Each structure stands twice: as C-alpha cells, then as structure tokens.
Structure 1
Amino acid sequence: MASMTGGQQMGRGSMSTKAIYPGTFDPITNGHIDIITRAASMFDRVILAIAASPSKKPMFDLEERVALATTALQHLPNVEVMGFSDLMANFARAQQANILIRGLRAVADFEYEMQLAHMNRHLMPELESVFLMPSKEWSFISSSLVKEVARHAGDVTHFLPANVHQALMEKLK
C-alpha cells in the first residue's frame, strides 16, 4: 500500500529493530558482552557505539577500544562496532536506529537513567530506550574496577575475553 502510505511506527505491529549500545568500553568486559549478546538475540541489528572522547581520559584509545570489541563480538553476526563523538541521540538518528540499549546495574543509576531517557525522548521521540539487567555473574564488575584490580596484580581472567585480558596486561607493563 506504498502509494497510499509509507506507514507509521506505532499501532501497526512489529517493525524492523536496530539498536545502539553506547559506552566507553575501556575496555569491554564479559558484562558488556552479555548485555549485547542478549540484545542481539531480540533485535534485528545492534551497534556497539564506543565514545571517542569521554570526559575522563581512557586507558585505551578509541582505536584500541574498537579493535578489542570487534574481536570480542565477531561471533555475533548481527552486531557491529563503531566509534562516535556525538550525543547518543544524534548517532542513533544518523544510524537510523530506533532502539537504545542501556545496562541497569545499580539503584543509584536508576534516577539518572530515567532522566537521560526523558532527554533522549525529547531529542528523538522515535528512539526507544530499553533496559537490561546484568547477569548475576557480572553484576559487580565494571571496566574501572577490573582495571584497578589488575593494576595491583589481582586475577581478572574470569571477567574479560582473552584478547582484552592480554591487552590489559600489556598496558600495565
């Protein structure tokens, strides 16, 4: 019925889904891998969007972050890894994504996440924020924590894919 309508997003059944999962991923952990694996099972396509210029200077540069993530996620056919340097809502628009994936680890994050979602709704009404809880296994890890443990020789092999673990060891002498 193309000559009458191109069709609306709401009220008309299921549409093609393309999701972005933004973060600094400095570096990507098993927690991140779990979130994106789960998202990629339920949406047609998923972009891991890596922030180029985070306010806090990252341990790994963008190129390194993108390369490590690309390797770590290569086994997921409907996932792609990109860097970006914009508002997540702008990247989403540029990429023609209709879903924004957010991990929801802590109660402290909830207020902030709801606020960002309201802002993103204002910036791009056609973008839906979707929230996934981390698996219990990964619920206490973060990039930051793994780095700090590793800096003082703690064992973090269980928390990272092999490629990332090696790269982290190299960064720490």
Structure 2
Amino acid sequence: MSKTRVIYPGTFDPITNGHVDLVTRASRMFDEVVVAIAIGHHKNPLFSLEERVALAQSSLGHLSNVEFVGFDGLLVNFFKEQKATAVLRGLRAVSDFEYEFQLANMNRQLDPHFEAVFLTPSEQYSFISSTLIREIARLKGDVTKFVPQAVVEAFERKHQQGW
C-alpha cells in the first residue's frame, strides 16, 4: 500500500493540449505526478524555465496531486532524488518508438531501478508537435486549437518584443 510517484519529463516548450491530456490521465492513476521541466542549457528553448513552469501551473494546477519542477543533469539522478516509482512518457502515432526504447534501456543500465511507463493521449492529440506549434505561432497563425489559452497569450506577449 505505498505511494506511487511518477515523473513526467520534457522540455514543455510550450505545454500543449496533448500534454494536458496526458498529465490528467496520469494523475488519475498514480498518487503523485511530477511535471519535470528539463531546463535545457545546451539546447535553447523558446520559453524560459519560469514561463514554462507558469504555463504548466495554469493548465494543470487544479489537479492537486501534480507538482511542477525544473531540472537539469541526468534524468536518472533526478529520478533517484525524487524517489520516483517510474517515469512517464507519451507515445503517439508520431512517436519515435525506437528512441523511447533506447532511452528506457540506457537509463536502466545507468540505474537498474529505473522504470518507464507509457500512456497514449486521446486520438485527437495524436498529431500535434510542439515544433509545428512554434512554427505556426512564429508565422503568425492561430494556435488556439492546439494549446491552452494561457499559452496562446504567451505567444502574443513573446511577439510584443521583436518576435
């Protein structure tokens, strides 16, 4: 009867309705869910860590078993420090299934306790990529159908500088 705690890592740059669906499904099946935002120092996210955490808190903060934290370093060290039972990842028709096996199997070799669980989002999110959403917003299209309203406003406010 001990508690389950799953980590859901990603760059969440920005959070999308697909991610929302996923976390909502995970929060129904596990006792605690950690939205783990990889800081992305060598990798350059469009939105800062503070913006990405805050956008995630506004979409998901009404679920009381979901926490929000930024991390860097190795996923397996974070997993250990957090006392996690597993890491969750999203699998979609558009997923690199073989890349997920690779991450799961390498991380198990770094830490034999590591465990990975996969959820599959509602089919209507099956085809949304964060890359395409950034590209649509960058070319001034409308992203309302793909992301929460707070993210739509964040793209205007990003645009209210040069962008």
TM-score, normalised relative to structure 1: 0.86
8 Å Cα contact 2:18-2:125 kept in structure 1: yes
In structure 1, what is the equivalent of residue 33 of structure 2? 46
Count of aligned pairs between the two proteins: 160
* Alpha-carbon distance between aligned partners in 2 of 1:53 and 1:153, rounded to the nearest angstrom: 25
* Residue in 2 that maps onto 1:96: 83
The DSSP-based 3-state class of the residue aligned with 2:96 is helix
Q: Identity of paired residues, percent?
A: 57
1:28 paired with 2:7, answer no
Q: Which moved more, 1:72-81 or 1:52-61?
A: 52-61
Shift of 1:15: 4.1
One-letter code of the match for 1:112? Answer: Y
- After superposition, residues 52-91 of structure 1 pair within 5 angstroms as 52-53=39-40, 55-91=42-78
Equivalent residue letter for 2:35: L
Structure 2 distance, partners of 1:55, 1:104, is 25
1:85/1:76 CA distance change after superposition, 3 Å: same
Change (3 A) 1:17 1:144: same
Given the superposition, is the C-alpha separation of residues 38 and 54 from structure 1 closer, same or farther in structure 2, using an over 3 Å criterion?
farther
**Paired residue secondary structure (1:36):** helix
User: Where in structure 2 are there 5+ consecutive unaligned residues?
Assistant: none
Q: What is residue 142 of structure 1 aligned with on the other side?
A: 129
In 1, Cα distance between the equivalents of 2:113 and 2:50? 30
Letter of the 2:124 partner, please give it: E
Distance (whole Å) between structure 2 residues aligned to residue 56 and residue 169 of structure 1: 23
Work out the CA distance in 2 between the residues paired with 1:66 and 1:108. 24
Highest CA radius of gyration, 1 or 2?
1
What is the CA-CA distance between 1:167 and the residue it aligns to? 0.5
Q: Deviations 1:32-54 (Å, cap 9, x if unpaired)?
A: 11111111110010000001125
Displacement of 1:107 after TM fit? 6.0
Quote the Cα distance in structure 2 between the aligned partners of 1:27 and 1:124.
30
Following the alignment from structure 1 to structure 2, what is the Cα–Cα distance between the partners of residues 54 and 129?
Answer: 24
Report the CA distance between 1:108 and its aligned residue.
5.6
In structure 2, give the amino acid aligned to 1:116: L
CA contact (8 A) 1:46 1:80 kept: yes
Tell whether the 8 Å contact from 1:104 to 1:132 is kept in structure 2 after alignment. yes
Taking a change above 3 Å as real, the CA distance of residues 31 and 55 of structure 1, as seen in their structure-2 partners, is farther
Q: SS of 1:32's equivalent?
A: helix
**Residue in 1 that maps onto 2:112:** 125
- Is residue 24–residue 54 contact of structure 1 (8 Å, CA) maintained in 2? no
Which of residues 133, 139, 142 is equivalent to 1:155?
Answer: 142
